[PDB]
RNA sequence: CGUUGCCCUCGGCCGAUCGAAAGGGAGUCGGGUUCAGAUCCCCGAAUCCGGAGUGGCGGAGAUGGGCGCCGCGAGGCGUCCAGUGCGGUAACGCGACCGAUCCCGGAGAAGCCGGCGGGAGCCCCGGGGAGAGUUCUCUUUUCUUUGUGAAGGGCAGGGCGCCCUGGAAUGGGUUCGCCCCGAGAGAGGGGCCCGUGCCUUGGAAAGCGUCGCGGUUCCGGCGGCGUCCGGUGAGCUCUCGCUGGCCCUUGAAAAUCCGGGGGAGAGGGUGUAAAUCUCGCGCCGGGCCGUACCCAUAUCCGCAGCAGGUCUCCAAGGUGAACAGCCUCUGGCAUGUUGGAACAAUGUAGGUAAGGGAAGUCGGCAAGCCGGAUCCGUAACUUCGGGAUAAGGAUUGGCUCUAAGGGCUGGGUCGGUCGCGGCCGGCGCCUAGCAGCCGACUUAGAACUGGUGCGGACCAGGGGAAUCCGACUGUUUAAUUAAAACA
RNA sequence: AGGGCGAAGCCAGAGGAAACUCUGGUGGAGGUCCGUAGCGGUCCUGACGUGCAAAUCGGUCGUCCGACCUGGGUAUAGGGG
């Protein structure tokens, strides 16, 4: 809290849009601009390019992910289920 | 180096309009060196007399067209800048002429 | 305009030829009712079939 | 245009069918030899004066040799 | 100061109407119109973002004029594809075929066993 | 050998066609020339595209190696094979280097915004010249002017997400910001791209500046001299480049052009061939239409030479934050459809007013106050971001000084030997650096000074306390309603 | 144009046993503020009102990186757009 007590990323917006909305945006607004780790090389370069598409700059691995996160929870839970059923079918 | 600039005034003197000795004297007075008017900055520049032709002979850096200025100043003092005109005859030289 | 089609240029040319005033020998013809051209078009007032 | 470096090479270029005017510019300290062709204007810089005077004679059948002034 | 005008009837400053200042032998600043900037070809691999070496990056309708050597490079996949992606293609294509052979061998042993 | 007829063989497309004088789209520039046209005429330098058959010529393909003889030897013949180019560890290179249908790829082909860097044009400064103006006094003066097209070749200067060596924690490298590294950092060596910058061919012959002649004339006449050297930068304009930021916005197609994978074919048989996405040269051609001028306080539209409207490019000095205003050069005008003489009332547009200070009026409408900068100082309230230039204060000129901020280059001196310079060996090793040489510009402080004047013109917020409405930015009745209406 | 405010990220220093927090920088966000060109059109209920003008003029104003301004091309036509 060097410059701001409690706005951070959403200090750009100034007074506008209301407190709740700006608090609500701060979560996403952070995550979406986060640089994640490319589970492919392991550098911290997974960066959202456009909605649902994240690109490693080093790996050059474009990756269909979430709108504001490299992974949605939904996607993750769906992944594991499919893996479980796959194993249940084939044996 | 040896910077040798003539300043010949042949046919204003032959018509008897000005005197070259007085012009030499005026040039020995004025010609400034390093921002000092009198004494030619010591034994630095040297002014010669040959009836009509003046020669200025410097050792230090010395502009040519400073002689044009001072002739123009001298010609104004004598009320000659009207029918007398300074021109570069050749390089290292000026030349007083009529119109 | 300085970017003309050929169609338009030719159109203008004829218009430019039509402007000239009557030849005075016409006045001396036998059954002459014509004194002046009366179809004269000045560019500054009256502005073409366009 | 094209500069040339061998006195022989310019002589060969001058000897072509397509060539014509072989004008010669005494610049002082240089003496060029400009020989026009179909496509290009070949020039050759010959720093020596006596060597240029010698070459002057070595152009062949009755070309223009239109010396420049 | 010498201001200046465009030399063509295109008034608007556009991709087509780009210029540069030049002093002539006549000692007048004049506009010369400038040729667009050509790009080197990018790789056929499609991952390597960097454009290819040893090729004259020039406007494509020029290539026509150019000599073959300018337009490519002496290698397999020359001036189409970056080296790195060739020497990975090579050893990939080799190593793959060695495993295909190993699976063929394991298949043939299984037939002889059964 | 062409040309055609027939037979077989192969062939996806994708919609005929139209649609851009600003999108895409090969290739032209310098000088001259007109009463009026010039990238179009003339001179000179280029260039693309198409053709080029019989192939016009060189060069490449390609002229090896073997064995057998004969010859002192250089070599000559006989006979056997090879020959769709070579160099580099590599990035990749070299003037050419066969090849079809088919396939893959690229280029054409990409938003806006920020920051930083390089290159030019212009400005600036210090000087050289040539011509000027000033000269009562002063002024080595102030003013002008001081050049090199495209296309080639060279070389700086940029950039590289290219390669090789090698192996980095005491982690390093490094940007204004970042950002990069065992998926290979630093360090060394290279490779490629752009090269609009220099040099050079062009090209001094041409241009410009000066002095000077030839000619009653006509005359694009002819000569001299010159066209120099340096330095600066959050400078501005354009541009090339790198690197970020923004998006529930992700920012054109196609014609055209190339590369690669393939390997169906073709070539001649030991001096030559087919082959040149041909290398260098040579020859021939490029039709059609537009091209005057105005482009706007007089060539356009508003009935007109109408204070209206109407898309762009270029863009000097001073002051200054500044493309603000004010004054200036370059260039341009004659005060906007008239003149003269008066200076009454009413006006229109400006100003100023003693004492009071909104008593005026529906209402502070109108005008006035405030205004820049630096330094202090800053409330309630709050969605904690704001409010905020809150409010409220002080300073500001001229002059003469001081201090503080940067770059470049230099020691390998002693001894030897070789030609002030090199090479070797030994000291030295400024390793707290010191010395000389350059150059923008700011900031702070101090003295003195003036009739307290100083952001001296220009530019340039009046504040405060509360209530009502609508969250906000946005939009709206062209021509009486900008709002609380719509969004 | 030119200025103001100075959001994330980044650096250092200081404290903290940790969690992390302070101080100074850097950085340059935004339907952010001032303010030019541009776009507009509040008030003077000013000028004009047989006008310059069948809606103009002057000052004063709003906005000026965004639901921004704007040329050309192209689409929608009358109980229709
Ligand atoms: Mg009209
Ligand atoms: Mg175009
Ligand atoms: Mg190459
Ligand atoms: Mg068409
Ligand atoms: Mg390295
Ligand atoms: Mg014209
Ligand atoms: Mg104009
Ligand atoms: Mg008047
Ligand atoms: Mg008048
Ligand atoms: Mg008028
Ligand atoms: Mg009063
Ligand atoms: Mg009353
Ligand atoms: Mg009252
Ligand atoms: Mg008021
Ligand atoms: Mg307040
Ligand atoms: Mg209430
Ligand atoms: Mg509102
Ligand atoms: Mg209205
Ligand atoms: Mg209104
Ligand atoms: Mg009114
Ligand atoms: Mg009236
Ligand atoms: Mg009038
Ligand atoms: Zn690759």
Swiss-Prot record, chain A:
Q: Where in the cell is it found?
A: Cytoplasm
**Which residue stretches, if any, does this entry annotate as coiled coil?**
none
> Mind listing the GO molecular function terms for this protein?
large ribosomal subunit rRNA binding; structural constituent of ribosome; zinc ion binding
> Which keywords does the record carry?
Cytoplasm, Metal-binding, Ribonucleoprotein, Ribosomal protein, Zinc, Zinc-finger
- Cellular component per GO? cytosolic large ribosomal subunit
Q: Which residues bind Zn(2+)?
A: 38, 41, 56, 59
Indicate where this protein is primarily found.
cytoplasm
First and last residues of each zinc finger (C4-type): 38-59
GO term, biological process aspect, one: translation
The role this protein plays is:
Component of the large ribosomal subunit. The ribosome is a large ribonucleoprotein complex responsible for the synthesis of proteins in the cell.
Query: Quaternary form?
Result: Component of the large ribosomal subunit.
PANTHER family, alphabetized: 60S RIBOSOMAL PROTEIN L37A, 60S RIBOSOMAL PROTEIN L43
The UniProt family comment states: Belongs to the eukaryotic ribosomal protein eL43 family.
Instruction: Give the protein's recorded name.
Output: Large ribosomal subunit protein eL43
UniProtKB/Swiss-Prot annotation, chain B:
PTM-bearing positions, type N6-succinyllysine: 53
Assembly information from the UniProt record: Component of the large ribosomal subunit.
Hey, which family's this protein in? Belongs to the eukaryotic ribosomal protein eL22 family.
Q: Which organism is it from?
A: Oryctolagus cuniculus (Rabbit)
Note the superkingdom of the native organism: Eukaryota
Leader sequence segment: none
* Location of the protein in the cell: Cytoplasm
Q: What are the protein's GO molecular function terms?
A: heparin binding; RNA binding; structural constituent of ribosome
What residues bear Phosphothreonine in this entry?
46
Single GO BP term: cytoplasmic translation
Q: Name one GO cellular component term.
A: ribonucleoprotein complex
Q: Which residues of the full protein are shown?
A: 17 to 115 of 128
**Phosphoserine: which positions carry it?**
50
- In the UniProt record, the gene name given for this protein reads RPL22
What name does the UniProt record give this protein? Large ribosomal subunit protein eL22
Entry keywords, A to Z? Cytoplasm, Heparin-binding, Phosphoprotein, Ribonucleoprotein, Ribosomal protein, RNA-binding
From Swiss-Prot, chain C:
Q: Does the keyword Amino-acid biosynthesis apply?
A: no
Annotated signal peptide: none
Q: What is its main location?
A: cytoplasm
Assigned keywords, A-Z: Cytoplasm, Ribonucleoprotein, Ribosomal protein
Q: Which GO terms describe its biological process?
A: translation
Q: What is the lineage of its organism?
A: Eukaryota, Metazoa, Chordata, Craniata, Vertebrata
Q: Which GO terms describe its cellular component?
A: cytosolic large ribosomal subunit
Superkingdom assignment: Eukaryota
Q: What is this protein called?
A: Large ribosomal subunit protein eL39
Q: Which GO terms describe its molecular function?
A: structural constituent of ribosome
Offer one Pfam family short name for this entry: Ribosomal_L39
Its localization reads:
Cytoplasm
Indicate the quaternary assembly: Component of the large ribosomal subunit. Interacts with IMPACT.
Q: Which InterPro entries match?
A: Ribosomal_eL39, Ribosomal_eL39_CS, Ribosomal_eL39_dom_sf
> What family does this chain come from, according to its entry?
Belongs to the eukaryotic ribosomal protein eL39 family.
Q: What does this protein do?
A: RNA-binding component of the large ribosomal subunit. The ribosome is a large ribonucleoprotein complex responsible for the synthesis of proteins in the cell.
Curated annotation (Swiss-Prot), chain E:
Sites of N6-acetyllysine modification: 35, 42
Could you give a single Gene Ontology term from the biological process aspect?
translation
Organism classification, top ranks? Eukaryota, Metazoa, Chordata, Craniata, Vertebrata
The record's note on quaternary structure and interaction partners says: Component of the large ribosomal subunit.
Subcellular location, principal: cytoplasm
Task: Provide this UniProt record's keywords sorted from A to Z.
Answer: Acetylation, Cytoplasm, Endoplasmic reticulum, Isopeptide bond, Phosphoprotein, Ribonucleoprotein, Ribosomal protein, Ubl conjugation
Q: Which Pfam families match?
A: Ribosomal_L34e
Q: Where is this cross-link: Glycyl lysine isopeptide (Lys-Gly) (interchain with G-Cter in SUMO2)?
A: 107
PANTHER family in UniProt: 60S RIBOSOMAL PROTEIN L34 (PTHR46595)
Q: What does this protein do?
A: Component of the large ribosomal subunit. The ribosome is a large ribonucleoprotein complex responsible for the synthesis of proteins in the cell.
Q: Which residues carry this modification: Phosphoserine?
A: 11
Q: What is this protein called?
A: Large ribosomal subunit protein eL34
User: Which compartment or compartments is the protein found in?
Assistant: Cytoplasm, Cytosol; Cytoplasm; Endoplasmic reticulum
The UniProt entry's GO CC annotations, sorted and at most eight, read: cytosol; endoplasmic reticulum; ribonucleoprotein complex; ribosome
- The organism's superkingdom is given as Eukaryota
The family assignment reads:
Belongs to the eukaryotic ribosomal protein eL34 family.
- Tell me a Gene Ontology molecular-function term this record carries: structural constituent of ribosome
Instruction: Give the residue spans that cross the bilayer.
Output: none
């Amino acid at each position: 809290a060097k410059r701001t007590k409690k706005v951070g990323i959403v200090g750009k917006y100034g007074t506008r849009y209301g407190a709740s909305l700006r608090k609500m945006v701060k979560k996403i607004e952070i995550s979406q601009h986060a640089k994640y780790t490319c589970s492919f090389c392991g550098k911290t370069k997974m960066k959202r390019r456009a909605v649902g598409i994240w690109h490693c700059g080093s790996c050059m691995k474009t990756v269909a992910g979430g709108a504001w996160t490299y992974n949605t929870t939904s996607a993750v839970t769906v992944k594991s289920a499919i893996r479980r059923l796959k194993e249940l079918k084939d044996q | 180096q040896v910077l040798k600039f003539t300043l010949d005034c042949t046919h204003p003197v032959e018509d008897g309009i000005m005197d070259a000795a007085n012009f030499e004297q005026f040039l020995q007075e004025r010609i400034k060196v390093n921002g000092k008017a009198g004494n030619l900055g010591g034994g630095v520049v040297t002014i010669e007399r040959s009836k009509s032709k003046i020669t200025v002979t410097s050792e230090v850096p010395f502009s040519k067209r400073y002689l044009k200025y001072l002739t123009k100043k001298y010609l104004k003092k004598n009320n000659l800048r009207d029918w007398l005109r300074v021109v570069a005859n050749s390089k290292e030289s000026y030349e007083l002429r009529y119109f | 305009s300085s970017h003309k089609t050929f169609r338009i240029k030719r159109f203008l040319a004829k218009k430019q030829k039509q402007n000239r005033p009557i030849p005075q020998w016409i006045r001396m013809k036998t059954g002459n009712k014509i004194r002046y051209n009366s179809k004269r078009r000045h560019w500054r007032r009256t502005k073409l079939g366009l | 245009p094209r500069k040339i470096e061998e006195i022989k090479d310019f002589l060969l270029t001058a000897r072509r069918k397509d060539a014509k005017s072989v004008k010669i510019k005494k610049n002082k300290d240089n003496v060029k030899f400009k020989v026009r062709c179909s496509r290009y204007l070949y020039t050759l810089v010959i720093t020596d004066k006596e060597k240029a005077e010698k070459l002057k004679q070595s152009l062949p059948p009755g070309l223009a040799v239109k010396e420049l002034k | 100061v010498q201001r200046l005008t465009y030399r063509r009837r295109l008034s608007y400053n556009t991709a087509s109407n780009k210029t540069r200042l030049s002093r002539t032998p006549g000692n007048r600043i004049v506009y010369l119109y400038t040729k667009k900037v050509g790009k080197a070809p990018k790789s056929a691999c499609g991952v390597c973002p960097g454009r290819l070496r040893g090729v004259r990056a020039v406007r494509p309708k020029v290539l026509m004029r150019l000599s073959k050597t300018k337009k490519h490079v002496s290698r397999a996949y020359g001036g189409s594809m970056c080296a790195k992606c060739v020497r990975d293609r090579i050893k990939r294509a080799f190593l793959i075929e060695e495993q295909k052979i190993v699976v063929k061998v394991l298949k043939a042993q299984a037939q002889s066993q059964k």
